[PDB]
């Protein structure tokens, strides 16, 4: 499947794509404002994620640091990124269907639209000003708005036992972005698409 990743933000982002134990395509790339990066994701990939990283420095070997979404200090991510990260999540070709969502379970850094470019399903978006409205206790100094599990490390926020409810903090994310997951047991906002669809991920879609 093809994913076209577009940075419509006025600032540079470093896109990342991983399935947790491996990079997807090249795994990461700088995207200046307006730039597009097209990647190919192998059919049947389960648990893939795409995210943006902000305020990065990398040397000529591809090693450095980002203030949001850092994946072990590499430009080309093989692992997932450090919160806060708005997440585009997908599993492809699962008994003939693709499944996509946006998640704020690991916080929010950059607004996002995640839409199919082929027919048969709808897209999802989280584009509100979550960082500007972020509760003081969740604000991340490097930028972004952390989830409550990352900050407080309780069984209720992290849903450790598989039983948890919504919280004041999850409701904050859900109010601003109803179509993204706000906690582990949120009513699913997953979209079902035809198997082998193609997609666009747009950072700052309203910019």
UniProtKB/Swiss-Prot annotation:
Gene3D superfamilies: Thaumatin. The keyword Endoplasmic reticulum does not apply. It comes from the Eukaryota. Its main location: cytoplasm. Keywords: Cytoplasmic vesicle, Disulfide bond, Signal, Taste-modifying protein. Belongs to the thaumatin family. This is Thaumatin I. It comes from Thaumatococcus daniellii (Katemfe).
């Amino acid at each position: 499947a093809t994913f076209e990743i577009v940075n419509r933000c006025s600032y540079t982002v470093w896109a990342a794509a991983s399935k947790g134990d491996a990079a997807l395509d090249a795994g990461g790339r700088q995207l200046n404002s307006g730039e597009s990066w097209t990647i190919n994701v192998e059919p049947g990939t389960k648990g893939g994620k795409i995210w943006a990283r902000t305020d990065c420095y990398f040397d000529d070997s591809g090693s450095g640091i980002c203030k949001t979404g850092d994946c072990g200090g590499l430009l080309r991510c093989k692992r997932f990124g450090r919160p806060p990260t708005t997440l585009a999540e997908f599993s492809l070709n699962q008994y003939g269907k693709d499944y996509i969502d946006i998640s704020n379970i690991k916080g929010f850094n950059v607004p996002m639209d995640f839409s199919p470019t082929t027919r048969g399903c709808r897209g999802v978006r989280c584009a509100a000003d979550i960082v500007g409205q972020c509760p003081a206790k969740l604000k991340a100094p490097g930028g972004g708005c952390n989830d409550a599990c990352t900050v407080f490390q309780t069984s209720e926020y992290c849903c450790t036992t598989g039983k948890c409810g919504p919280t004041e903090y999850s409701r904050f994310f859900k109010r601003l972005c109803p179509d993204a997951f706000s906690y582990v047991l949120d009513k699913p906002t997953t979209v079902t698409c035809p198997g082998s669809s193609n997609y666009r991920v747009t950072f700052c879609p309203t910019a």
